[model samples]
Target chain A: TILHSKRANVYYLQHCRILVNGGRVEYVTEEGNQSLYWNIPIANTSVVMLGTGTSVTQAAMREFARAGVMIGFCGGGGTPLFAANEAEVAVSWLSPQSEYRPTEYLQDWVSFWFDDEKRLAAAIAFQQVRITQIRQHWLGSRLSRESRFTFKSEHLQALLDRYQKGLTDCRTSNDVLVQEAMMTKALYRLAANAVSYGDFTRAKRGGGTDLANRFLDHGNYLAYGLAAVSTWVLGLPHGLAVLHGKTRRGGLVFDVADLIKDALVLPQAFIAAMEGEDEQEFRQRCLTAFQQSEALDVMIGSLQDVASKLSQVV
Target chain B: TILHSKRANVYYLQHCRILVNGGRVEYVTEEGNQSLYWNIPIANTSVVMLGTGTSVTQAAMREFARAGVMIGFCGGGGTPLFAANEAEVAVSWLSPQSEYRPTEYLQDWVSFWFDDEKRLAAAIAFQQVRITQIRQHWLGSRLSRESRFTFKSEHLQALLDRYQKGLTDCRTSNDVLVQEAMMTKALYRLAANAVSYGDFTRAKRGGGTDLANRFLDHGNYLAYGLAAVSTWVLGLPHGLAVLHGKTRRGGLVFDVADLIKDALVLPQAFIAAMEGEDEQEFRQRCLTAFQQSEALDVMIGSLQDVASKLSQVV
Candidate 1:
């Protein structure tokens, strides 16, 4: 359904050869000395992720890059991508230097990034969007957002309100991070109660036990993957952080992923744990939730929004 | 290696499958009923280009990424990437992993990156280093004598003067670009005359007519690839250009490539074309020149110089 539509699409394929035949991206299969080709509708393709057992031809690469379709050869689950380089180098292969330069987004981003107060202001601006996205996406899947019973806890709303209010007086990214941490702790409590699992301290790192914690770790990796994808798509440096500390190398990745992690990942983690689903099942359910909420769009939109906002200056 | 090991190695291959064989990076090839394996030294390898007839396993990709190796799927030449759309490819030991990345350089980098005048000063500083590299590398061999280029040539001195004056007077990126353009044009003329090929208009695209233009185009792609690798090894984004216009998405790649292209690519291109050598022959010679002069080291050196130079002020 996404094919031939302008809606952004991401693909992962293996055990195939990608080529250009008759001016179309053909997903080619070797069929007993003959070949069957499925045309890739590149017009609607935003990203093409070639997994294990995939090889691409030069002609195909040229066409995909020319169409502005991001192409990456990533791990199966799409972690640690080698993207954006392909597109830039591909463009360099055909285009002139006249077309080379930085984008306005990174331009205005560093505009205020060097200033402490402005950086904090940008973080505050993004924190506001963080609250906004959770409000909208959590209102999704009525069962998850607002339960049918009168047993819905007021504590969740109180936590959201508290986090939202602190942004005004918040002076540093660390301050924003603390508020974010505590608010998520409230969600962890909500998740624990919802799943009828008490005495669950939020596991910072992996341990052999605790189903919800494991799912949270696994699900968070997925968010990081998408966040890394968004970072590559926009050609932004990784260390430049707004919502997180600069101590992380790919910290901006975590910053962007945090934008939507609670909105989609948190609830799914608890829900899957509650249902006693396997890790794979959690992945599938979480990815399904991502599609339903158009999570990639929100991630991309939120990133662009904050960059353009610049605390409201160019 | 220059930053971490002081040597940059790029591997290109075909007719093989890439995999991690028992915790070691291996290239597997089928020979009739038997399979052969070649181990890749990950620490020394910065980039791996999988050309036609090559596929990689997910486990291999994981190992490569963890080692900070940039694996790209490209056409035969390995000069430009068709599928690994990374802003920068090689994740060298000194590049990523916030703990290992040399934060001092980027710290100084962004210090001046936000200031228009300081950034331009850094660009000019790099431009000076660019010219110095060309002089040093080009003078060390027979190519300089045969090409009739002397460090003290009146024409060359005049060009440098014009460039130096232009840089001092430059108020914007456009002025910098204009001066850079004129300098490259002068080199094209010199290179053309060096080969006794007169009346070359410096064709932009291949009509498949002129060999020198084709080689120049091809050789430039190789330079750009190295530039991309250098940027990646430094964990710098493609758009954060210095000497070049920031108009292109990956303009910094061009900036870094331009540092060594004229000194290495342009002359060799003309030399190979005049001899009526094959495209493959040109690639070999260009790559040889790259190794002999330690082009990657120069690129990383130039990058660190510019980055660290700004730190001196901060």
Candidate 2:
């Protein structure tokens, strides 16, 4: 029998307990005297997310690492703690066909990020997909990927013009990130209004921040978890990115995760805050919403498509 | 429920029967006074292959075409007939993100294919995957995509050298196809020896060809059925190709099918012929071997990965 890749069985667990028993992962949910245990094959899991209040034994972590299962821990303050498999080596999950050369690929990707035209095209595509989701009302709408957006606000139009200009003006990888950030800000404001979250406020790792920050942290981790898995599977170097600079350990993760921010995370975060949901409830809602939106699949495909473009020169 | 694109459920039928009644495809097998029927959802089938002796009513063909199901008729001479939904448009079966631009995508692919370096890299990758397959025993070896080849023959080395030279020498798409043919010839020779098919003589739509032709026809249909579905789903124009110039109606089909020939089709055909099996029995064996090889999944994934590269410019 063909050993199918474990990429299909990615699991996200939050506010629970985990341990390795034998070769499998024993998932535990404790409510006073009541406890529920699920024995999951450690080898079958491509990635595991440990969210707030979640604890895992060292043995479980070892098992996961041995099995090449990515383990991600999210802190209460909305920052990613660490990935068990630190994406230290850049490898596309796709074998042989990734041009079969890593050094050339790395160079190609770095150059692709630096190119003005490629960055602008990808940035526009990213914004379009995100805007479609926002315009179509939410996760339930089928108009996503098909709907067109036309802003009535001149401010919004100006913001978009500035962002597009920034992309065009990009001379380095950091410039792309700057333009991307501007786009994100613009989209966030739109999302905030759409979800009735009022205003856009970007925050990370601060418990004292507004509800938007809290929601963003939860939503972003979900995106990161996806990007990390995608980077690993696509055999892309996590240290390389098209928009983001190369200093960050998970630069590619941030790059990919950033693409879906306006389309997926931002809107979900805004809606959760608008409903005045607690962190746990918001996290749960975001997870379900992301899956329902089918945005992860889109991200994976987009990552491949974009990366394929970047690798053309190689 | 997710209305998954009907691009995966490709059915191949030979020496069997079919009819359309109430929008369902009815399969029938007759033995004397006895018969068995299976009511299959016609809308769910992305492609259907009607082999020699297989017949279907105009009503069924209409239903299949209306649902955008590809109907491939395999003749005794080992050739693929028209797809009901001829891949006039390019589409990716892998969903959520095909980069979703048809006209633009077509132009992108055409340009991407025209690029010298891009075409060479892809051609090498394709040949490598095929070479790996042909070198391995067959589908059950589990080494189809992973194995590497070490050439020992001077003529083979010269052939490969000539092919690469031809690629570099290529000034137009037709030149690339000429180079591709050189590679194909070299690999087919190796495959013939591996399967003891003796001298390789490629033939289509002729009953007089060797057993290799029979096996190739079967394997090719499997590839075409898959390629057709992928082209339709990915929103790609099937008439466009990177290696082969867009002259043939099914140029993209030939392009895709060519990649798998060395790796999947050739060895299987040779082995089936070496066994001196009957046509019907060999066809069954070839089908089982293809499924068991899990090469279809590889083909589908490869098609997307490669097509993504081709569409980068768009």
Candidate 3:
């Protein structure tokens, strides 16, 4: 059962109002009570008023959802019907107190919960290096090992439903930037979700063996970000097609990026991250590490590099 | 929706029995009835005969389950569930007249169903090419990409789990081969499952402007197959490790497969498969497609060759 927050406790208050007289209840209202409630204390008469409302905004609820927290409404006996009624978004909530914690498993990948983005970054960074491996070994090898190269060739293969009318519209770069940031955040989260398996948690503690291992969770984000930035800086299309072919300006950049994952990122970033460094220092370290690593030099020489070098290799 | 085959159709016989029995008694079993069943021509309330039971072999039921056959089961009073403790293979039998015909979607690539080992092989071939792609573009590329050599300087990682129970219990080559075959089948199935997106089917239907798109799917299957096989061959205990360290083999394969998708496979194979000449002999297609086709040539290189090179390249 996922609880929406760490502070998900409830408290009950019994009768608190005071009675002025024995027979009439004394409560404040537009029509004030004249006497005690029918020969009983105000508590016995039971004029119960529920809490007016809550201040926790729906935005906050959304934030809680984004944070992987679960919120539920308790309706006692009618719960199954309510749950079914709102099945679209209403995830079945479990009683957290009764849930069993994986003592070993949870502890292993502790960093996933705390240092989520860093974990994903490491994985992306590794894939970033893996790009080059394909180029060198498969493409240039004497045996013709380098063939796999289509996915990176195209960008956003499908078109967006821009034809639809919606409550909102986009205009400014501010909105775009916000959207990008949110996307990055989501990407990081997705990477984290993927990395949360295995001996990922610390053996006896919450932290991973090292920070880079922590960051491997969000490797895709880093890989994508680096690819995009590299594509833009190099003044090439981000998505270029080798088999599929790219249609946009950055196409080739993506092609190059796709080819050089091994040469560009993995081996070096993983070693660096695992070797004991702060997660925050990862990106900077990666920039230099990627350039100096051997994976890249080898790929620049491969036949696979032939296509991208001529077309998109900046 | 993915229903088991034998249990899906029993209504036709139930309806027929209802019609032939003159609305008096229902004929439940499809065969070996010597009495009341009018279809059997013999009627008796005098003697009883029974037959030994094994597994039910019903064509219509199997057809309905596997290929969407026409003869469907229906029971009285609307739907079939009641005190009737009839198990599908137990009570309901199959007839031959009905066969399943796929709906409009059946012809599309997205809706294509593969139950053949060769299809599995093709999928594996595709995965091999794709993994090669991931390994190349991201891992192989080095210049300014970001963290490199994430794992140790190992070209491909390895682990020894075979002898864990004892050296004598170590996996034999045959055992490994069987596992590899099964793994390939699984990987192929996965890629097949991955093709559910409408784009693949639409593309297969010639709706894709570029005829090359078909090979992209093929390439994905092969590359993913290669990476997974390579992982198994390495005995690294397949996982989603940072920089290809260690994680669940399936999960890690999934992550790695996701990464290389663009960098390696799509650009090369898709167009080739679509535009390739249809040899009258079919040319023992899968074995040599990678070599003769330019698209496949770029997407997934030969694994045997790449592994051989890696031995020396590192």
Candidate 4:
């Protein structure tokens, strides 16, 4: 039996006829008849729950763990709250139930999470971090003779740490302090020559003694790349954890990845590090590095691209 | 541990947040999520009105029968026609009926017969006969000049008789005659050609005679290639069969084969049979002769390509 494959949401035109449309299943014999049958649609589908009966349960657990939202019943009638559906789902409240249950508090948290100001602000910070990283990575690959050394990874990290600390000191979070501190610091550093991207020159290609140079050199590039790719995945399914529903669909990750000027950092830095890596090889290395990196290795091909594609619909 | 095989469409976007909205199935995974589930679409849907359980018995009995029109009733009567999109699949009709059973009428004459003027006009002149025939047996090892003259027992008999008869009274299928007579002759010829291809060319190493030159000499480039491909797919599904749900998707032979003509025919022909009767060795024979000759048995790539892709979708 020849196992067949088809892409969803994409129309494949083969031999002047549409071969695969949406999501439908077919089992054909070697002789070429539709031997087996079950039709499925691709769009607006609950693909995650296709075979798993308790996928929703697992999903609710995740939301409770990650977003601190507890499932619950309505005020008095004991209406068990379902995640997306109104069909009375099983429920429980995490933490001590005050006058208001944790579910109520969770709802408020979700409402606040959807604030455009917060998303836009995070998006802005992510973009800056992305640009900084890309520039640094590009410069690190090969520096020119005249290329000047400047603040590296440690410097940026320390700077970022300090700025974030200041924001914490200001008791700002969820938006305001992060913008005032982290975004401002990044902007200042950008305007100043503090994070210098010199001409491409050969690096020593050995273990680094200077954390700042490494940051300005390679770390920054990867960080920015991650930020860009991560942002590009915003419009994908879960654009926001607690706030957006399945249909809400809005993630800035996609927009930034598509249009952000963070390309320079990643490829250049990567070339410097890899010297002669092919696309496939680089993808493997990126996957490994992201998986093993202390700061988190986030490979940029399959993982990121998949995320980007998923955010488009779900 | 649930090992998500990379081969399986298991996309794990680390940053993804699963959400529920309405009652629909939607979630974030990497890209190609929908395609991962369902790949083909159902088209030209028709009714199979098997008179409930009894029709299943009728269908079983007449699986390969062509005795008469098959019969069945439309399903899902209460719902709007669109609501039960597949309501019209009546069982195959075995014979014509006196009662006004539209389904019975459909089974007897119309199941395999479509009433389209355009298709009828297209069918008026049988296209792609030669192309389907030659594709069955072309091979690399048999592409030499000597091999081109090799013939199957039946084909040899025809060739010897034809050679003995000389080209005087023999009409090579193109001879004009009365319309009905011509149509009958053509139908028989096509049938003979189809059967011969199945019997001879489909034989392993050297199916039929390596008529690389005859096909090339005839200048029926499209004819030979299409026939070869179609013959190779003799038991294979026809693209038009898709309209009736008789075949799988994407195995449309004619169109994909046409695009590769230069790659498969001209270059190979020019090198071998085109210039002279002197047939070059297999490798020197280029695409046309090389692929068709007994030296190198070449089948249509499209058959495999389309078949391979379609396997996973279904």
Candidate 5:
């Protein structure tokens, strides 16, 4: 299966038709006939997660692959992903034959990553970008109108102040780590309180006891995919993480994904946590924002910036 | 081991009907038109890699989906890639959800990989396994009794000596890769000579020229697919390779693929090229060979073995 590391568009379809018509991308319907046929913006899309009641065609799948669009099948209302496919490519980017590509960024990254101080600076830079995006995103009124969560300017400003103070006040990596955890905690509590459920403990691996929890788990996977995509595109090895200190190769994936998680995933997942709320529709809202916000494009840009931070270092 | 939120048991089923029998998910396979039922541990599973000639009842699918299980479908026996994507694509991924998979092996790998001697040791170890599998498989095969290659075991041993000796005398990663190319050349020449085919210089994405070339191309993609799958499952980066010795993305995939390709793909490709036989039947044969020989299962075990090499390196 091909991944969109360079980032393009994100889509969700349910009880819909996905077909290639007249050399264009696709048209959609709800009742398997004609609720309405919507034309897909093929070149502008990245992922299409098929929710319940959706059926796609061979012609469309062919076109999807041709256009480098990824299609995933998921549960009803796109609550969680269920299955996906692989085609002629042996690996994610593995083609029909051994191919050549350049790696100028990787060597530069290795050199940059070797120095502890510079790595930390880049780490903080990545974090700053994270909260910077969070502050800008929640400030928008469109998100407020689409989901139940309110992005109060005062609370957002308070959280932003807390981060800026702690970032400069940090004496060691431990301080930054704690501050990061606290930031996540504050975000979680705000979302949970807004959704009227005050007792949502973020888990390394929870029992998935509630909707809010599961959707958080679900949405985070998407963010991680984007992170993986970004890292792969930059040709950055997953082991060389600056912020996510650990033995995990995917530690870098975490560091990269945290750049977008709270901004893109945290809010909609909270609203989906509310009673009888339509998750697929909410997932659509989140994914649409993914495209409109150019989340992955922004991710790749910042990731390259961090990767290239020490290109001229001795 | 239990499948925590990040992991699950992935299963692949073929020539069977999946149904919910007596409130348990049961896969019913028929022998001589007689059906037999096998119960599934639904909750513990993730993706059920479903293959052709399989019927899935709604009751069974609902049971699996509601329990957070993923059902995947692919080409027959899921071995050859893209005989067609909608159908005929040979591969299935019954893997963890790619969300922070265990990086124990990844940790173990880079430590070993960073040292040139250890990396060479790993490649030598890999080639040793590769040649052994090919020799054992071809030397004692059911169809060889009726086969056209009237060669003695002497022919196989001479080639083995070339590899086994090169295995030890190798000095660098490039040296190992050179020998890889040499071994492939030797095998290709041997297969052609035995089959009495005309001048066929093995092309890297060679022509759509001969059935043999196309079949070789077709079969190798699947080999690469299997390599890619097992490698991804191991959580190893495709950028690192002991044999390929280059900075190619997914280079390690080529390193991993040879363990099975010479044994499983080469002879059949020769057989196809010689007689212009059924490509469909050839895919089936190769895929069936994959199952009967337990290619992937052993490939994975061998990697797990390779992964642990560093803990004992010091």
Candidate 6:
């Protein structure tokens, strides 16, 4: 079964007539029995999100599934519906020198993400980029402030070094995982203080200090949605994780999300929560931010970079 | 033979493996022989602009043609290559009460633009919207300047009346054509003087005074590219023109481009020409401005509006 992969298309459809002809898809409408037809090349589409009141014929549905086109039913309250057996095996190309052995045939090719060295390299790259982004953000903020802090790159680099050390000497992926959390904790505190959001306490499950939890969840979901498309495109197994252990089926999703979350999500989320913003508005802002940053494109490129690193060494 | 229609699909392909199995189009690439495939539903696509180094199979091309997918070859010097005899009949649906009789099956359907009354109404709408845009530009300029000019809307409206009279008493479409040129000429003078470009003189084809001629041609070409896309999407025939006379094959391309040239392009061109800026930089600025203003979407909508008004009358 095809997975619901509409977000990767960079656009969405609503209130449009859709029809299928053999293998060709068409948008057909009627103006006083004068049929107006539009050709739709479904094969080119990654996936289609069918919004509320959208109509689809049996032939179109069958053809879509047969062509491996994922159909997501967006019902009332913007809920997404998909079949239980809709899982598609997506395997990242594995390297011969991969340190970890695959337990099963996942998505045709085993992911080189399992190798400890490649995993650390990817994590470090992700962290470094995030730091640079944070530094840029800090510098941009200084331009508008009446009372400016001494924004120093040397200080940022020093802090980054401390986090890098945590990853560098790790005996296992778990050590790297702990380091990610510890580094995030440190950064979150700094970001919160920078934004005047007071002391920071990590939040989860929609319950935490003030609105920070809501902010975290909203940002995390945004990152997750982005990562999901990257995972599907890269054909990476959902269960196989590096920093994130195989605690859940989507452990790898969390692992990928972790790479950019500190730099991209946390700072913005903290600021929004401090302003007591609406959940929906915050979500929308983050969505726009991700699109502007070309988050999906960057993630795909980063994944390719990580995969190439594995090939180079092993 | 399928026409090269790139305007319909908002996408372009670069260095990806393209394949076709039955009717489904797929983009299959490889990383270390680990195949990475992408589905490209060409039936839904209006046109595919094939960039340099991009490969396409004969079978895929055959399927694309059969599906009515437009294929444009982009090669040396970044020029586009398309097939001959690729014309598609596009008739603007006309009402029975149309004032003028069409000479032939012009663009498939009888255009309401032939009727003097309908054409006048469209011209007025176009003129009014352009006035509003100009007012906006005037008001925005006031914000940045040290000294403000008393922008009189009443004066502008009075000037608009003089042009409306030309359209109101029009006996032929040629009268409307002359009126458009007269109106544009009048507006050009105002805009040039407003931008402090000294005296204004009409320029075309390397003729007329100063670097302003260069500015006019650059802006016209920009408008032409946009209008070309609109013509493809609306399925409007290029040769069949309303306000423009039968001087060239794509007289209508100029007709559509004329609608927004005054409101959007002229002022910017004047400023760029006066500054004697880099040609590439000026082009890039205009391109960015068009996207920011949602110029293509607006043009498409305006084309539909004109068609609807034509249908409403003739």
lDDT per residue, candidate 3, A40-64, as tens digits? Answer: 1222111111111101112222222
lDDT of 1: 0.64
Candidate 1 lDDT tens digits, B1-314:
32433445666677787778788989888979999999998777766656556666555666666676655555553234432333322211112221124334555565666566776777788777778876666556646555433234566657666777877788876688788888878867766776687778676433336888788867776676677678777776655666553434456777888888888887788888878898778888888788878888888888887887676342
Tens digit of per-residue lDDT, candidate 6, span A152-247: 446556666788777667766677668767777777766666667776677665677578777888788767656655654444534455555434
Q: For residues B96-164, could you state the per-residue lDDT of candidate 2 as single tens digits?
A: 111111222333444455466666566555555554544443433443432332224555556556665
Q: How is the predicted docking of candidate 1 categorized under the CAPRI scheme? A: incorrect
C-alpha TM-score for every candidate: 0.73, 0.41, 0.17, 0.21, 0.68, 0.40
**Which one wins on TM-score?**
1
Give one digit per residue, the lDDT tens place, for model 1 in A192-270.
7766776887767576377888888988888877677666555566667776666566677777788788877887787
Highest DockQ, which number? Answer: 1
Which digits, one per residue and each the tens of the lDDT, describe model 4 over residues A185-292? 453344234324333322355445332224223433333333322221111112332211212222222333322223333332333332443433544434333333
Candidate 6 docking classification = incorrect
lDDT digits (tens) for residues A1-314 of candidate 2 = 11213234546675577765566778788878898888867555556666555654434543454455655544434654321232221111111110111222223343454355565555555545444444433333532432232224555556656675665566655566566676776766766665545556676334437888877766776677777766544445443444442333344566677656656566556666766778777767555655565555666667666656655453
Clashes of each: 21, 22, 171, 101, 4, 16
Worst 10 residues of 1 chain A by lDDT: A90-99
TM-score, second chain, candidate 3: 0.23
Query: How good is the docking of model 5, by CAPRI class?
Result: incorrect
Give candidate 2 misplaced runs (Cα > 4 Å).
A1-17, A22-24, A29-36, A39-46, A52-69, A82-162, A195-200, A204-208, B1-314
Q: Kindly report the interface RMSD of candidate 5, rounded to 1 decimal.
A: 11.2
Docking quality (DockQ) for each candidate = 0.17, 0.01, 0.01, 0.01, 0.06, 0.01
Deviation from native of the Cα of residue B231 in model 2, angstroms: 36
Off by over 4 Å in 6: A1-11, A15-17, A21-24, A28-41, A44-55, A65-155, A311-314, B1-314
* Candidate-wise lDDT, in order: 0.64, 0.52, 0.27, 0.26, 0.62, 0.51
Candidate 4 per-residue C-alpha lDDT over B1-314 given as tens digits, one digit per residue, 9 for 90 to 100: 11111011111112222222332222333455541221111011111121111111111212211111112121111111111122221111111111111111111111122323322322222222222323332222343333323334465334323333332342322221223233323332332343233221221111224343343332222322232223222223122221112211111223333333323443343334323443223223432343333111223333333334333121
